[PDB]
Ligand binder design. Structure first.
Ligand SMILES: CC(C)[C@H](CO)Nc1ncnc2[nH]ccc12
Length: 164
């Protein structure tokens, strides 16, 4: 079902696309959200995915937090994918702008190994403040399952590919 991706490794693929638009087109088994520990989906990938669900992702997430408490940085939970995917894997990468340990980025990507194929963004990059070139390297060196990476910014996509 994935189309137009550039192969980077045996198991990692990349495309210049909004992950929301790719999810609407493909309806993958799993879409990854770039979540925070409170599952407050305000902006970046999380705010865009939640808006595409008409806020249903946020209502589900608030019930999850009321029952279970916050996630750990480096942790994840599986919730519904609503109209975008069968499931959403909410993964918390460290937020560099909040001073979180960047070594937790490898722990964050290890969550992907529980799923055979995923549509995903680069964890900890974008509004989370980490270097996206570093995030792509940790992804390729950590994830063993099949990952389709969507990168919205064209200038960044070209830099990620040309420096790989
Ligand atoms: C995470 C970051 C490197 C990347 C830079 O374009 N942001 C995104 N990538 C893919 N789909 C997106 N929708 C909303 C944001 C967003």
């Amino acid at each position: 079902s994935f189309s137009g991706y550039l192969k980077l490794t045996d198991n990692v693929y990349i495309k210049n696309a909004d992950i929301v638009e790719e999810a609407k087109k493909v309806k993958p088994t799993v879409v990854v959200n770039a979540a925070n520990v409170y599952l407050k989906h305000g902006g970046g990938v999380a705010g865009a995915l939640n808006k595409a669900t008409n806020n249903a992702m946020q209502v589900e997430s608030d019930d999850y937090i009321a029952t279970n408490g916050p996630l750990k940085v480096g942790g994840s939970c599986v919730l519904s994918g609503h109209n975008l995917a069968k499931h959403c894997l909410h993964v918390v990468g460290p937020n560099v702008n909040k001073g979180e340990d960047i070594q937790l980025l490898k722990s964050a990507y290890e969550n992907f190994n529980q799923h055979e194929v995923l549509l995903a963004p680069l964890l900890s990059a974008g509004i989370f403040g980490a270097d996206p070139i570093h995030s792509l390297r940790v992804c390729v060196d950590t994830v063993r399952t099949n990952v389709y990476l969507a990168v919205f910014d064209k200038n960044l996509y070209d830099k990620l590919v040309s420096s790989f």
